[PDB]
């Protein structure tokens, strides 16, 4: 009864059935992490909630170069309590791995439980601004996604991408205007952040306002070229 | 007190069911999408079809713009009157 449809990228599917929906093919079947629904069509598929994860919001907002492919290594900064990092582990599958990072402790415990559930997730519960304590653990990621809230966002991204990014690599930022400035217009703040990344050698390619999902949040996709 | 308890129970019933309904629904984004280029000749030369390597409605559609090589509704029953009817039914609910 339900119909599957591939996305513009790999590992992301769209269910056209009684209702249109965005789904991901399970690597682990029959076990839900945060009580999300599922669909079997027979193999298993898991709903991606764009309101509750800032990555699928950029997906439904349309994004050409999303660097997460299946057989790749992705570093997730700000994986709090595990939802979207479970989704990106689900879309990378067994070959690709995901190095999750978090600092706090109750989302840390939830992330540790979910990393006991899933094999591709490898969790770090360290200060995201001190990259050495997982420099001793992580090797040469292919692409970085980051969703933090500390206002030195370009600072921590420059640090982690100088230490871990593959050359010609990919880097995805989520930016919260109401947290970084909260007085000037969000377009001006995002242009200032784009300039900061361009200074710190991220050649940007696009940005995108997550309009119907969050207030004043944007996603910036850029590449890493000829650096270290 | 008993009246207010009854109204409060009804309100929480409807709040939880509205949460689940909006969780199972899906919307379309309407956001600003900028694309950074490096040369103004290319900036004047820009075309979204030529960029994404797609066609007309694929350009104007957001959640899926599959390329021409990715491309290269009879399964659903009465796709001109029924499917949109059920979608609008869920939205109205």
């Amino acid at each position: 009864k339900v119909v599957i449809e591939p996305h513009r990228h790999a590992g992301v599917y769209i269910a056209r059935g009684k209702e249109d929906l965005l789904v991901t093919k399970n690597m682990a079947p029959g076990e839900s992490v945060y009580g999300e629904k599922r669909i079997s069509v027979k193999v298993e598929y898991r709903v991606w909630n764009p309101f509750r994860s800032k990555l699928a919001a950029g997906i439904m907002g349309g994004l050409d170069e999303l660097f997460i492919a299946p057989g790749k290594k992705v570093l997730y900064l700000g994986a709090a309590s595990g939802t979207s990092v479970s989704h990106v582990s689900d879309v990378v599958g067994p070959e690709g791995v995901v190095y999750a990072v978090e600092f706090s402790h109750r989302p840390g415990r939830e992330l540790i439980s979910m990393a006991k559930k899933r094999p591709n997730i490898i969790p770090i519960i360290e200060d995201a601004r001190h990259p050495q304590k997982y420099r001793m653990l992580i090797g040469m990621v292919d692409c970085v996604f980051a969703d933090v809230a500390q206002p030195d966002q370009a600072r921590i991204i420059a640090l982690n991408s100088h230490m871990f990014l593959k050359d010609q690599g990919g880097v995805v930022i989520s930016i919260k205007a109401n947290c970084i400035d909260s007085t000037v217009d969000a377009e001006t703040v995002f242009a200032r952040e784009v300039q900061k990344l361009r200074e710190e050698r991220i050649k940007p390619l696009e940005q995108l306002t997550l309009e119907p999902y969050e207030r004043d949040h944007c996603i910036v996709v850029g590449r890493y070229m000829r650096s270290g | 007190t008993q009246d207010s308890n009854y109204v409060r129970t009804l309100r929480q019933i409807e709040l939880k069911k509205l949460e689940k309904g909006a969780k199972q629904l899906m919307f379309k984004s309407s956001g600003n999408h900028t694309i950074f280029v490096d040369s103004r000749e290319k900036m004047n030369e820009f075309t979204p079809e030529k960029f994404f390597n797609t066609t007309s409605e694929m350009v104007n559609r957001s959640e899926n713009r599959l390329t021409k090589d990715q491309l290269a509704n009879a399964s659903s029953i009465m796709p001109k009157e029924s499917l949109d009817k059920k979608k609008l039914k869920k939205f109205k609910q």
Binding site: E5, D20 | L71, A72, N73
Partner: peptide, 27 residues
Amino acid sequence: RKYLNKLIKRNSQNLRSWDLEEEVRDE
């Protein structure tokens, strides 16, 4: 070439028939 173009057009027509709307869009 033209055959490929027609095939792409057919697939696009299928996708459009999947996800299309008239005044249903504004509604």
